[PDB]
Design a protein. Sequence first.
Length: 407
Amino acid sequence: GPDETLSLLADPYRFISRQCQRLGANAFESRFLLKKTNCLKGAKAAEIFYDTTRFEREGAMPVAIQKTLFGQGGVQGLDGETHRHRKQMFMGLMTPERVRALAQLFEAEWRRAVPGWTRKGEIVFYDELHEPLTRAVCAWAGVPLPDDEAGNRAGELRALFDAAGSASPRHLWSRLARRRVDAWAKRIIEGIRAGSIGSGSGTAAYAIAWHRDRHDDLLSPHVAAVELVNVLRPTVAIAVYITFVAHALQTCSGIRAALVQQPDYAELFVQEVRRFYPFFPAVVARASQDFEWEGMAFPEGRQVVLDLYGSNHDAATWADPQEFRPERFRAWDEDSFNFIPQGGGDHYLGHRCPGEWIVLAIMKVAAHLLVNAMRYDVPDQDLSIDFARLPALPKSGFVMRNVHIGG
Ligand code: HEM
Ligand SMILES: CCCCCCCCCCCCCCCC(=O)O
């Protein structure tokens, strides 16, 4: 068949589900970067995608993603016992107490940043979030971050995910940002190992610097650096979800009141923001052995893409996925495959995002602050979601005026 890379790139979140709807199927064979690719969508497809006896990640992600989004040698590219041993290192960071600590640091940094926002008179909300998140996560992770460098590090971390999927010179900036952030994280790992940096025993940078692999060897410093950036970078990417929290509050009538007046509502609300809004489009794996599934061939070595956005909008699962309705989560049975904005399956046994607890905790802080503490005006602007952008955002970035926290 024809190469459809251009069609995918023009509609990265919806290309797969639009083609599925046309064909009346949850899977179809296509071709990207000249490679035959099976595209999958929905709960049943997610369950097979997460079967590690049939799928592997090693070598699956296009190498332009190593130079930017993920780095080289990190957990995303591992399989089998090597993967599970590395994954445990990340999971150990995520205790309720440690997640709460990061949420508290983020609230503090948000409150610290407000006076600057008031003084500007008008802000692009998305643009203002990267730095407080950077400051909170570095402190949490045991990464020293001088006051006068926080801004620059926040821009570099942002560039890894926000400029990575840009078909322009912004991609070149993402590559330089990656080189810089790796070198910085590497100096941090080296200083922890030499004892010149006193990160605490509970902190991410300590855990990663002192992690021993399956042969009782420390991670090479570059790999430790990449894994540390695998904590810092996606925490800063929560800026996207926080912007969507603001977008939902602005565009969906009744949400603000319910959040104000119903205490259990915030949990439902942040889950629905993750279900509803596009963010991580799709994940890629390679078939590890010959099999067939639902009348489709999966020859060993076949590239396979699992459409996360389409799965989160699958009508069989949700009935009315096109609506923004937090109360739908009252009927959710916590299935590991039917709701997958940060991946599916098991956190320890597969590649599912270990950052979900942090994301939920921080999105709740954001919701709380935006309804209970912050006052702001929202001028006329284009709030529509840019489905052509990676990551997707409201076209305006969400512009606020007259921000303050007397509220
Ligand atoms: C900002 C919102 C986030 C989104 C949309 C997101 C989404 C995802 C997705 C889709 C995956 C891949 C699942 C797969 O390969 O099957 C993933 C993996 C990962 N996430 Fe996140 N994530 C976010 C935040 C975070 C945070 C805060 C952390 C901090 C620890 C984090 C750390 C990771 C790591 C280390 C992996 C690789 C895990 C593995 O391969 O086993 N993420 N994430
Ligand atoms: C060859 C073109 C590749 C296009 C690159 C696509 C990048 C995906 C963008 C999704 C939003 C980024 C989410 C942050 C993820 C993370 O921090 O790990």
